[PDB]
Design a protein around this nucleic acid. Sequence first.
RNA 1: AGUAGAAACAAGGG
RNA 2: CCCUG
Lengths: 623, 119, 515
Amino acid sequence: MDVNPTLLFLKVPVQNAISTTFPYTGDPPYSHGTGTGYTMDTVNRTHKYSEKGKWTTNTETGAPQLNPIDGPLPEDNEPSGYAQTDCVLEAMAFLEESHPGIFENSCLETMEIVQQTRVDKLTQGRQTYDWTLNRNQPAATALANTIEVFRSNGLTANESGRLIDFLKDVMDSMDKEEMEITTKKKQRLNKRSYLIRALTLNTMTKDAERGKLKRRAIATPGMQIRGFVYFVEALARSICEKLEQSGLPVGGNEKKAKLANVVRKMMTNSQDTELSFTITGDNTKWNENQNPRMFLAMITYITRNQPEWFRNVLSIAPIMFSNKMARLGKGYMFESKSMKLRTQVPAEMLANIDLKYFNKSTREKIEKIRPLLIDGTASLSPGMMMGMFNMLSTVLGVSILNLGQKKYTKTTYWWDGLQSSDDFALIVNAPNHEGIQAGVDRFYRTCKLVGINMSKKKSYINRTGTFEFTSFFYRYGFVANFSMELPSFGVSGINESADMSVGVTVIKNNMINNDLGPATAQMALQLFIKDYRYTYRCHRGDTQIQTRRAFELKKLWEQTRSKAGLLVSDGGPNLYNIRNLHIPEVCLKWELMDEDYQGRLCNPMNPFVSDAVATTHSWIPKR
Amino acid sequence: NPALRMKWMMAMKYPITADKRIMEMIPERNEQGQTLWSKTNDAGSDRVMVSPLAVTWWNRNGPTTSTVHYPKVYKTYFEKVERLKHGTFGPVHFRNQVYIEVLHLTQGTCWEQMYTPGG
Amino acid sequence: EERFEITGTMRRLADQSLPPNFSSLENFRAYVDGFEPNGCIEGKLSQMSKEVNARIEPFLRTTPRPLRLPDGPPCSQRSKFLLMDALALSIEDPSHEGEGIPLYDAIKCMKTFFGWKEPNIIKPHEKGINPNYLLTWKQVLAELQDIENEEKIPRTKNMKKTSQLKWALGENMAPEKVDFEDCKDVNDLKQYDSDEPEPRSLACWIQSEFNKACELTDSSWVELDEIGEDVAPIEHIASMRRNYFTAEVSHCRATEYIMKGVYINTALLNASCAAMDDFQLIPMISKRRTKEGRRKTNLYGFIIKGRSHLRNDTDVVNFVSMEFSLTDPRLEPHKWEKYCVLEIGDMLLRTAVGQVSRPMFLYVRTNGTSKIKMKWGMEMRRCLLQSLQQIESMIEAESSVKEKDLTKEFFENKSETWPIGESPKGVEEGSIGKVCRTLLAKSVFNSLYASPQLEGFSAESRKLLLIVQALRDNLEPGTFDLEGLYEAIEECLINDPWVLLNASWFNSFLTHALR
RNA sequence: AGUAGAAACAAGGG
RNA sequence: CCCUG
Ligand SMILES: [Mg+2]
């Protein structure tokens, strides 16, 4: 006999045992070296799909730019970026018609949030790009540096503490003739240098990613674009909240409801002689085909009949994104085997350097990208490198989905489905197979007219009843969720009392959201208990394990009358269970402690002190 | 990673930091001779280094004070345990899919548990 | 009230962010304001060519074909420690110490063997200097004996920086770091070699490894804590499931692998982070409980760890590992490409045939590891967790169809056997316990042999699995482009033996499913 | 030598 | 010899 878990599918359907196809117990892949190669490859590919556009020279920054909008229609099945303005505007108009009043309400809510917001929101975020030090810094430090540098020159319009005032200061600084920065040392940058710095993205390789063989490059913006992007995302979220087909920004409790709702809507109304089919598929090169000019057109159409200031503040972001620059990155590394040397070549020298060092592929990339470099960075006008517009693209996809109603199709077949950024699922109803094919072709062609490309390698069609959507596996009404990786239930490492509550809350939250089963929850609780006991050395009182604290724990255990009231930190028993994962420990056993023991435990004059309950165990460890 | 950092920190002799009056309440040596605190002072402050054996000694040997107030201030937490203790459970029903607080135990992926709180 | 005016520079920037044949931002806004839709999409679709379409290719029982595997020399073992060939020297420690010094345990375990002899090399390492390994082994023995002649017994033994340890731990192999200005005029200056892995073909040893990983032992390798009393019926069912699984899976070998790896990685990480500039010695120790409930401590071998000046999460630390065993290396030599094997002793075993004098070999190998690999290997226990979920999920699914729990119908029924293996006479069916052991073994091996190729293969084969399942469900499947999927699946089978084994499993399942 | 895989580690500065 | 992981 030769064991073979795959053969297990011969009895139980695949969707019932899909968890066996996720290898999420090893270390995820990482990247060693620089992300310059990936960045150059991404830039070249982004410029490849729009080769038949209009080339121009920028008057302010001086770098070449490419504009494929309204270009020649596509001919073959290769990815395309020529999005037609008329088609996009028509799709937006029809989406507005189908849901009257959506844009007005979204604009009102966005205006309210713009009025109310505050600068402090910029502090919460990932590692941003700091242009004062030309590096990557946490949001708070970068914001502090930028505000200090702004105040060095005369700029005091953001003292009111409103984000819009900060944006006004940024815009005014853009028009300043010279910018001075402190390093003690000082430096001056003219208009062009500061402008190029303000329109720069920092690129690096993405680490710890599953489901892919080869690495990828992702980008992060500066500080002058964050606020406008935040406003645009607020507007997009407000619009998406009112859409039934949008898969964002919901959690994991109603997504199954959404799937069942769509299936029942597209099945129940069907007669007894109507064919229904389901397509599950992805979108290819989603981020490298969305032109910021189309986003500007969409934002202009959305905000019709509005105050001028609102239109300007909302439409600034596409303008900046359409004139962005990409930093090549760390550079390359050279090795001399004959003389045993190693050296580093910074990216700044890639523009002017002999190509005898590099191999074929790197030399070709350098040659292709050379005409674009300016001041050590590459112009990237077309495409969205990192896709911070995660919700406007969803709105566009949902508009295309809506475009397939029975009214607009004007034919026997019809369709509808679900969309979430890159992923989508479709259901097509028609009386024959010819109708099914016609509907599929119409959807594909209409999608191509806007710049949305469907992946033919990761997509398949079958009879409706079973499908998949963002790792939610639907089969005859039963939906399984596998879109989240199981964490390690260990000790956080703060205190004896913080760790208990933190771990119990982690288990409870995983049980609630990510659909953790009961038995797995009990086993996780047992493993965490073992780890906690072996970390803090607070073993049981009757256990015969020898440790530094053994004597004190045994004496305390012997003193007490009711052994069930002792905390797990004092060698007590374990009382937690599934029904108790919400009660804090001290309040869980309060009616089971001794008078003197519970008097000493919560002593307010103890020297150690000065969801959780203050006790003798809340101490501060040494640095 | 803080987890391994504390794993290593707990292996030392005196990983905890306390004030200076601790020396007046708990003794320097156990009933078996184990040390509980050291004369060395913390860097940047007047604190002193203390070992978890001091925490256990205080818990099992230290002044006692009435804790009548604790249930009053933490009334919300105690109400939850009272309601859980006095509640009544029911049969499990496997079917297709004051109450919200226990939501993690009543509902499930494909099962339902009958629950009425005892308050 | 609100005043946000676009200035000159911003106006000049925005005048160039519009579609073509538009002059200024005001003109674009005016055009968008007065836009009314009429026959735009229909026209553009009319002008399009007919080559832009999505034809559906039918899927039938004769359509799919087996995957293609690479060719080359057979794959070789690439784990941090031996799995099937391991042997341990065992003693008893009735004084339950929570965490004692492992060096003394190692010495006490060593002192129970009275069959040492003069080592020699029988299976050499082709690309390395063999005598250095032998010198390293003799040096470790000499240091262990030197431990006796000391005023005070130490807790850790730092090996002397000898020539053989300098070579084995790759000392002074990094080139010198200079700037680009000085060494620009050199004939052999280029960038590093960015090539692809060299392909290898599947071998038969990994199947045997997996088979032996799914077997039972005569000891207990896991001990878990307690939980509260079960009052709700849901808790009763949960406890029943958990207890049945734990009973069926606690005597498996995969648990031994989990504990062994956890201990080794924990020791390595602590040693690397504590003693940065010393050549530390770290033994391999594990704890078990016999069938009678009597504790035992096993020793597997030794490792020596070199300089550990690690900065990032991918910096490498080298070490040298020596392990005991009884597997004759001259039976599957291609499995031991990177090992140097010495015959160090003569053991004697006792069985039905009486007493047999077997030889005792030592496997010596130079390896390396990063900080992230060690961090992710200290938490192999989660494998257990994962396995449980899998089993439980099945029942949950099987319950929803019939609206009734089937835990007892799954575990205690002593029937309803699952097809889990393959045999020449046909498919083989096993009980639930075999299924639990199989899933635990699969999870453990997924943790042991992690690599990006495995992730790619799994992600790209899931879709083919689902398509085949839909075909078996007579739902009339159809693919827009099937060959691209096969290319994406096959692009990830290069080097890993685990991925090649998974591909072979997929081929066998595909053959059996469409029959 | 070894880890590893499209670019790096196999210690760096004074 | 010092500092840094
Ligand atoms: Mg999908």
